[PDB]
Amino acid sequence: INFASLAPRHGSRPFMGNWQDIGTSNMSGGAFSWGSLWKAWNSSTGQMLRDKLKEQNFQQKVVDGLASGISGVVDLAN
Amino acid sequence: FASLAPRHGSRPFMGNWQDIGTSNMSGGAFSWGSL
Amino acid sequence: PTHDVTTDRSQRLTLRFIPVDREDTAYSYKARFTLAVGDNRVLDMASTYF
Amino acid sequence: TDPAVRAALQSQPSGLNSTDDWRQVMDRIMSLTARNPDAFRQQPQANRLSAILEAVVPARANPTHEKVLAIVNALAENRAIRPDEAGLVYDALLQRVARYNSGNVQTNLDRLVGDVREAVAQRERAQQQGNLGSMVALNAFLSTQPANVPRGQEDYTNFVSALRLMVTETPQSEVYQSGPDYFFQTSRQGLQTVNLSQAFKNLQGLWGVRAPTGDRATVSSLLTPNSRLLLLLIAPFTDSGSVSRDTYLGHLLTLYREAIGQAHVDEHTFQSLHSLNSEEERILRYVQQSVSLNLMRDGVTPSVALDMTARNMEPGMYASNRPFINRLMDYLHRAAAVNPEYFTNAILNPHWLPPPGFY
């Protein structure tokens, strides 16, 4: 009775997730990551478009799926 | 061991053994967090 | 850490290489560089650029 | 955490593996430690130098706070003061010492920390030893009671000794005097409080004359329930023959003793030889799949099918499991040669296992 064969294998080693992860959330005291980070009267054109581009995309730190990027330092916005 | 590491304490600062890595566009990812 | 990180010997950080050969055609281009590495160091190719 | 006020203190005023224990640091810095040698040889320079500089010339320390905190913590764990009073009295004592300090004062302070350590240990062991205060109170009460009973005397003094033994043998029991009476509580914050004076007054008249009358329940109402509880609490004590039997008191004691006895006793009583390893099962399923595939889509003969399966195996696993795989291949070979129906069934049906005797 071992279920390791069902899991994805990360190379001679099953990819067993942390057992400490079973959901629990309520009104106060429960906070989850990935927060809400974010005819022109004004013709600047430029920053405007750029800003719209920014508005449609993303950035944060626990986004560590895969890799952070080369040489390093550990930072915030936890 | 290693003496070549930043030491934030008397104890050395060393990451996880398992740190070497991969991703193919594929979706061979779409995988979870560092946590 | 102090020891075993940075060599005390004089060592360039950035090297500039001259193209030892360059043959041009009416539409294309060609360059050959003699990429040299010091005998006691390692080069990460990602930093190399034209 | 720890009761020893020295230990429960020294967790508070102390680093971790500093030069307070110089010998361990000096052992670790050269090479002497065997658990993990060459640890110190490869630290950054500053740290190394600093320890060394600390090691050759130690730096003096002021132990006044440690000793004062030790004695304060001893007072706290001994119910001398409340914990808030502990926080206050620490500063109070610190000021007292600081405004009268001398070498003699430090010497007396060391003497005092030793004394309070011993005092806490003694108080704990005495509280777990039998609480002499209850014994003193009981002896005072017994002195108040008369020692002579006109009707029967052996049973009376035997019972008195039994009560003495009971109060001695079970710590946490309380004997005291609140009003003009003595009492006996079987535990602090506990029920079952017996009015000892009233119980003895009632029992005085039943000692040496209730033996012949035990058969008839004519005088049974003379026993007030408080005295009944008092007798019940002494059932485990005063074993058989201590109180003369065939006596109403003796009869009750014997019944209660028998009952409690059955109880504790009962309570302490309370309340196919070869099968394959997962790796071999994986190999078996792979062999089934490969042989079936070759035999069904390529039409090859079963022997050639078995041969083709073998080769396409991972060499490491094939060499690691050479005996089992060889035996399985030979078994399937002879099965396909002899009994084609059995071979086809065993090569096409999952949940199949090799029958016993194949080993």
Curated annotation (Swiss-Prot), chain B:
Induction: Expressed in the late phase of the viral replicative cycle. The record marks G28, A29 as: Cleavage. Ubiquitinated by Nedd4 following partial capsid disassembly; which might play a role in intracellular virus movement during entry. Changing L35Q: Impaired endosome penetration and reduces infectivity. Residues 1-28 form a propeptide. It comes from the Viruses. Transmembrane segments: none annotated. N-terminal amphipathic alpha-helix domain is essential for the membrane lytic activity. Late-budding domains (L domains) are short sequence motifs essential for viral particle release. They can occur individually or in close proximity within structural proteins. They interacts with sorting cellular proteins of the multivesicular body (MVB) pathway. Most of these proteins are class E vacuolar protein sorting factors belonging to ESCRT-I, ESCRT-II or ESCRT-III complexes. Minor capsid protein 6 contains one L domain: a PPXY motif which binds to the WW domains of HECT (homologous to E6-AP C-terminus) E3 ubiquitin ligases, like NEDD4. Belongs to the adenoviridae protein VI family. All late proteins expressed from the major late promoter are produced by alternative splicing and alternative polyadenylation of the same gene giving rise to non-overlapping ORFs. A leader sequence is present in the N-terminus of all these mRNAs and is recognized by the viral shutoff protein to provide expression although conventional translation via ribosome scanning from the cap has been shut off in the host cell. This is Pre-protein VI. The chain holds residues 6 to 40 of 250 of the full protein.
UniProtKB/Swiss-Prot annotation, chain C:
It comes from the Viruses. Induction: Expressed in the late phase of the viral replicative cycle. It is found in: Virion; Host nucleus. Belongs to the adenoviridae hexon protein family. Major capsid protein that self-associates to form 240 hexon trimers, each in the shape of a hexagon, building most of the pseudo T=25 capsid. Assembled into trimeric units with the help of the chaperone shutoff protein. Transported by pre-protein VI to the nucleus where it associates with other structural proteins to form an empty capsid. Might be involved, through its interaction with host dyneins, in the intracellular microtubule-dependent transport of incoming viral capsid to the nucleus. All late proteins expressed from the major late promoter are produced by alternative splicing and alternative polyadenylation of the same gene giving rise to non-overlapping ORFs. A leader sequence is present in the N-terminus of all these mRNAs and is recognized by the viral shutoff protein to provide expression although conventional translation via ribosome scanning from the cap has been shut off in the host cell. Homotrimer. Interacts with the capsid vertex protein; this interaction binds the peripentonal hexons to the neighboring penton base. Interacts with the hexon-linking protein; this interaction tethers the hexons surrounding the penton to those situated in the central plate of the facet. Interacts with the hexon-interlacing protein; this interaction lashes the hexons together. Interacts with host dyneins DYNC1LI1 and DYNC1I2; this interaction might be involved in intracellular microtubule-dependent transport of incoming viral capsid. This is Hexon protein. It comes from Human adenovirus C serotype 5 (HAdV-5). The chain holds residues 52 to 101 of 952 of the full protein.
UniProtKB/Swiss-Prot annotation, chain D:
The keyword rRNA-binding does not apply. Residues 1-19 are annotated as: Disordered. The modification Phosphothreonine is found at T269. GO terms for cellular component: host cell nucleus; viral capsid; viral capsid, decoration. It comes from the Viruses. Residues 9-19 have a biased composition (Polar residues). The modification Phosphoserine is found at S220, S272. It is found in: Virion; Host nucleus. Interacts with hexon proteins; this interaction tethers the peripentonal hexons to hexons situated in the facet. Interacts with the penton protein (via N-terminus). Interacts with packaging protein 3; this interaction is required to promote correct genome packaging. Belongs to the adenoviridae hexon-linking protein IIIa family. This is Pre-hexon-linking protein IIIa. It comes from Human adenovirus C serotype 5 (HAdV-5).
